[PDB]
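Predict the structure of Cathepsin K.
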Amino acid sequence: APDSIDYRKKGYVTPVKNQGQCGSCWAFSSVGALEGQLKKATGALLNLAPQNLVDCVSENDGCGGGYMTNAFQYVQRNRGIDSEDAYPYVGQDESCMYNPTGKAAKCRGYREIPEGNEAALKRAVAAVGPVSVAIDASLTSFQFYSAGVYYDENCSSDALNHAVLAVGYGIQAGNKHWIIKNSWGESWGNAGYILMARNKNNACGIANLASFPKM
Ligand SMILES: *C(N)CNC(=O)[C@H](CC(C)C)N[C@@H](c1ccc(-c2ccc(S(N)(=O)=O)cc2)cc1)C(F)(F)F
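Done. Here is the predicted structure for Cathepsin K.
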C-alpha cells in the first residue's frame, strides 16, 4: 500500500458541492463514494444526484439526516441512481421522483471498514478509492478551518454527527493526514477541503463508521 495518495489528481473526484440548509451530508458522502467507483469501472466521471437519495431513501430522514449504508442499500434495490442533470439538487424534502431514463450508475451492496481501525481505512482508500466516513464536526475550530492539519483534543470519537468523503491521505510537515472532501461549498475551508489528523487515536471518530459501495 502507498505512503500517500490523492485521488483528486487521478480524476476520481467531482467539484465540491454545497448542501445548503438541509442535513443531507450523508447523501453527498454517498454519491461521492459512488462517483469514485463509477470512474474506476467505466472511466467516466459524472455528478450523481444527492436529491435522489434525500427524496427516495425511506430508511433515512431526508434533510433531517441519515446514513450512507441506507443510501447504498437503496441504490442496490432500486438498481440505479440518477445523474445530477436528471434529478437536480434543491435542498429540501420532496416526494420520490426517480426517473429510469436518467440512470447513470448502480451498486451491488456495500462493505464496512472495522470500527476504529485507521490502518484498515488506509488500505481501503489505497485499493478501492474514495470512502464515505462519519466524523464529529460540531466544534468551532472545524467550522472556521483554513490551512494545516486539523486536530482538536475536544473532538469526540463517539459523537458522530456529520458525513464526509475521504479522497486520500498524506503527510504535511511531519503530521499524517486524511484528505477530506466536505459538502459546505468552496467558500469553506481550503477550497471545500480539510486535512484531518491521521493516526492520532481516531481523531473525531474518522474510522468509526466508514463504508464504500460495491459495483
Ligand atoms: C448531515 N448533514 C447531517 N448528519 C447526518 O445525517 C448524520 C450522518 C453520520 C453518518 C452520523 N446522521 C444522523 C442521523 C441519522 C439518522 C436519522 C434518521 C433516519 C431515519 C428516520 S425516520 N425517517 O425513519 O423517522 C429518523 C431519523 C437522522 C439523523 C445522526 F444523528 F448523527 F446519527
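Residues 25-42 form the longest helix (18 residues).
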